[PDB]
Symmetry: C4
Subunit: 257 residues, 4 copies
Amino acid sequence: RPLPENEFQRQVWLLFEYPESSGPARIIAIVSVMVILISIVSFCLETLPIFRDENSQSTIGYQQSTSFTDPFFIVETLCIIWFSFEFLVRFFACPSKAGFFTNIMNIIDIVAIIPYFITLGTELSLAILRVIRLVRVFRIFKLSRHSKGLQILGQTLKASMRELGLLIFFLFIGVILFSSAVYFAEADERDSQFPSIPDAFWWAVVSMTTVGYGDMVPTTIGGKIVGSLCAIAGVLTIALPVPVIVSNFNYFYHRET
Amino acid sequence: RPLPENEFQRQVWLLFEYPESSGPARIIAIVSVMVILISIVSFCLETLPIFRDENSQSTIGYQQSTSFTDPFFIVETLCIIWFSFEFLVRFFACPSKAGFFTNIMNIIDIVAIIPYFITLGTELSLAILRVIRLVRVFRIFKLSRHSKGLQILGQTLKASMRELGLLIFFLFIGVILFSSAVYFAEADERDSQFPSIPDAFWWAVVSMTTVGYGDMVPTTIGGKIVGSLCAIAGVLTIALPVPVIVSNFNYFYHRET
Amino acid sequence: RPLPENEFQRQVWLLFEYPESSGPARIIAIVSVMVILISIVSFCLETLPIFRDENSQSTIGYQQSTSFTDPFFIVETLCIIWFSFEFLVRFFACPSKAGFFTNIMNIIDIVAIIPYFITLGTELSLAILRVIRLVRVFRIFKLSRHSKGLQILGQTLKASMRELGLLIFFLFIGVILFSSAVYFAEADERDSQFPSIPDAFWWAVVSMTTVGYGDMVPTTIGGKIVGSLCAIAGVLTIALPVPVIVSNFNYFYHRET
Amino acid sequence: RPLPENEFQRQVWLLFEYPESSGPARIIAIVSVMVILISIVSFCLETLPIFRDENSQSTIGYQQSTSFTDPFFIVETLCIIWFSFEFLVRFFACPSKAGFFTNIMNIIDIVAIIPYFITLGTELSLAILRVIRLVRVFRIFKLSRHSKGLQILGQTLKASMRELGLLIFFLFIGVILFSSAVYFAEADERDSQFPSIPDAFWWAVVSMTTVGYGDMVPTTIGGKIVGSLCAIAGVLTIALPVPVIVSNFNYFYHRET
């Protein structure tokens, strides 16, 4: 699986890939950062209740029409056009079409570009539109191309998959254990806040993480003892692999310097 | 506790003890993992309020009868049969009867197998059934035979008994101290949320762990000062032996690799 | 290490000071631990509303009389008698009269022994009885003579006085800063939960410690930004000197080994 | 330690700059510390509802008039006069006038002195006075001249600007991600507590920091899963650069000793 070998990539790839190459490259990087931030702000702003009241045709969050009256649609279209231009230039300057599914920073652009085109295509089994609108948030991840800190975070997450899986596994074990314990310790009352073990999962996760919401809490003596143990075990279980993940992050962090 | 090695049970012990020995061993390990997960899911699902609201057939969550119409009973019986087969094969290949109370990974199977048979026997004071049903959750601990991370967690807990006991001791000391302080600082009011020191134990544990529920909180100036000190001392007391436990976990974790 | 030096109290000092010296010494240590625990449980139990509701017989929690009908008074008197006997023996074996400000493990006994006698004398202005009954809780600290862990905790606290003071100083700085910020950011509304900066002190301490109660929370945009900064700065400020205190504890902990 | 250049600056500068130089210098340092604390207490006390309710007379908290009847105005005027005297003496005795815009310990005095004079000038929109009163709290930062711990904290903050920025960046990324996820997972109900993504920003910050308020919480299954992930990712994101900041603090802390 060799590279395309077009011999056409070099100039545009250097212009749009290395911000330090030239002054125009730095200008392009700054413009890209501002466009990403503008798209993020617009995405967060379309959800405000000021605009939701006057809105198949509603799950999209924007009105696609020839007139293009919605300012949010205008901003989203401009940002999507810029992202499309960037991706097309880089891909026509990207030799390794085979390694396209290996680089995360290009499938990130794919993810940031796909939702608009799916919504346009489907305008011309129902939760699909909501799922796409949710996936559209991953345009936040496109800032990783411009920030080395997010790249180090990505490398840390890649290197700490085993420790992250262990953290999730220990959380699952403790959540099941303490949810069962608190459900059975607070089962013989009508005022209990734990109708079921899956309903106690939420309380268990909230207590182990030591977040603490108060939406559901133990009321019995045994339930309170179980909650005490839940808090202690949550502290311990979280503290076990977090130092390993932190050491990975520090190694990848001071490696660049 | 190794296998007898009589040259007759050797094949069965190799199949049911070393998943990496052969392809069928890996299949058996995967089937065991799926059966354990199925049992956990079924156990968590019988408690859903779909069935409890329409209330020995009630405290157990499953109806033992000739017809055997309950699907949850069918799933539990299948999982218990598989666990019974596994334990019987391994014990028939396990010589060391003297170390019956020493091995944890086989008394775990005993614990996962016992509640079903006690409930069957006792179907033919009253909190015994609830205690048995609560103990039945420990089939979650049976996943430790297949995951090395849970084995490392068990080794860490065994190696950090003194530090864990010190953590619990410091928690008890601080809880008594701050429960007394907040009870006495918030005693001369009709709206106090601390009827007694044992009732302030819950608030103390919640504050020292920094979970934070809001179900009971100080309302006086002295009570708020006491709660401030409670939060600070809880952070400090938890942070004292957790690094020792974490160092133990990291040692046992990087020991395997 | 040296003897009491009285030339007479050597045998009693060996019996009552070194639990490992002989079997009777271990018996005395176990009896002392049980008596301390019994006193702690009785102190925590006199405050239960089962007994307090029948309403100095209420400010003190025990009725001092010739009949001595109250079981709590009987238990407290027995524990105080045992503590008095221990203190009399050890003080008859304690040389340093002028060292009133230095030794802690004997002024702990002084604190555990005063409240009963001072309340008996003062029975014969009003907050004195409540303050004494609060001080009576420090009998929990008398367990430090029997536990090496609490002794190591005391040595850590003595060695980390500067770092603990820095922690309290940073907490005070951040609490003042964020209390002022959240009071001024949430001042122009009728439903604000921060009537004053000292009233915002409680919210600041709760947020910096990341305990989280919800009794008072920001409701404005600026108040929510201030609370965000408060949580971040609380995490950072707590995390600054806690590692130093933890290193002190670990040094004093592994020193015994 | 540069030359005075005036033939007059040296003596006053040594008196008002080095507390350990002489007894009067230590007296001046103690008086300055007491004056700073008195000003802080007065500032925190003017906001109490006892005084604010019975009232340009409300935005400032003090009435500037010839009579000067307000005790809070008297205390603030005395503290401002002392700060003015200190700053004028030090500036008259300060050789390096060039580094005034770079030195932080003198612009801190400028910030502590400016609000009083601006309010006096403006007495002789409306949010300007409130902003000035809020800025007036930075007199808390003037204690850094007298405490070496706050100086070490300042050096740590200056040395850990990149890591602090990374912490804020990761917090922003996670907050946007989880706010969008929880808004979309809890959108199709009448009782949703997340009207918009910016309204979910508060919940995200509260959950990632593990503070936990309960003012808004997920109610759906998907919302609860999103909140679980939010708590886990908040723990991880906070734990990534905090050890680097703590190492910076420890380096600057043991450097002095």
